[PDB]
Amino acid sequence: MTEYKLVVVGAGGVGKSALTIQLIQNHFVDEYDPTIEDSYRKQVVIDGETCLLDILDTAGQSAMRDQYCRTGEGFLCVFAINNTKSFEDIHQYREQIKRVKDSDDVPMVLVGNKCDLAARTVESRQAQDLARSYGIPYIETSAKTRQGVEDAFYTLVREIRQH
Ligand SMILES: Nc1nc2c(ncn2[C@@H]2O[C@H](COP(=O)(O)OP(=O)(O)O)[C@@H](O)[C@H]2O)c(=O)[nH]1
Ligand SMILES: COc1ccc(-n2ncc(C(=O)NCCCS)c2C(F)(F)F)cc1
Ligand SMILES: [Mg+2]
Numbered sequence: 769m770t771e772y773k774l775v776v777v778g779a780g781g782v783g784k785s786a787l788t789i790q791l792i793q794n795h796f797v798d799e800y801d802p803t804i805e806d807s808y809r810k811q812v813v814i815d816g817e818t819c820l821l822d823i824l825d826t827a828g829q830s831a832m833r834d835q836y837c838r839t840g841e842g843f844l845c846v847f848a849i850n851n852t853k854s855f856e857d858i859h860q861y862r863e864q865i866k867r868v869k870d871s872d873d874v875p876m877v878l879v880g881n882k883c884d885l886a887a888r889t890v891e892s893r894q895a896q897d898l899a900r901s902y903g904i905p906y907i908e909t910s911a912k913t914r915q916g917v918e919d920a921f922y923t924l925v926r927e928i929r930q931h
Pocket of ligand 1: 797910
């Protein structure tokens with residue numbers, strides 16, 4: 769059965785853990801210990817293929833992190849649409865992933881999370897322009913409502929498959 773190794777990165781509080789828990793448990797967490805970093809497994813069928821997703825939920829700024837980063841096959845780069853700084857921070861995550869992989873062609877999806885909230889300070893167009901400069905998709909998500917969550921993770925799988 770095919771395994772896909774996914775790594776979820778981004779600034780504190782953007783909803784990395786909430787996105788992962790929503791994907792797996794179909795539940796929205798209001799507060800999740802920000803120090804817990806672990807990998808989680810989910811068996812899914814994607815485009816008729818039974819897949820095992822091995823998802824590293826990163827935390828902090830570690831051996832485990834360095835290990836999945838080096839062997840990680842695709843990256844969700846998450847910001848929150850009500851957190852301008854987290855959007856601005858994306859570039860640091862992408863630059864580090866490129867360094868790790870020594871490549872500018874890394875399977876990656878830009879994720880704008882918390883799209884259920886009204887205090888939007890990052891426009892969709894801004895994030896689209898950033899994603900276009902990186903040559904990657906942009907997808908908006910809400911870990912609260914589940915909007916976009918499956919699309920973000922499964923699109924990352926389809927990006928890994930083009931690689
Ligand atoms: N309204 C809303 N809150 C979210 C969403 N995703 C995460 N949160 C909330 O934002 C905070 C940080 O989430 P968390 O997953 O711990 O962020 P992390 O530091 O990136 O792992 C929590 O209070 C979560 O309930 C979302 O999509 N919508
Ligand atoms: C605003 O300035 C910032 C500087 C550094 C970071 N930060 N925190 C952890 C990591 C990391 O290495 N994660 C693993 C990457 C390989 S998988 C990084 C980054 F260097 F990438 F960005 C965030 C914001
Ligand atoms: Mg977390």
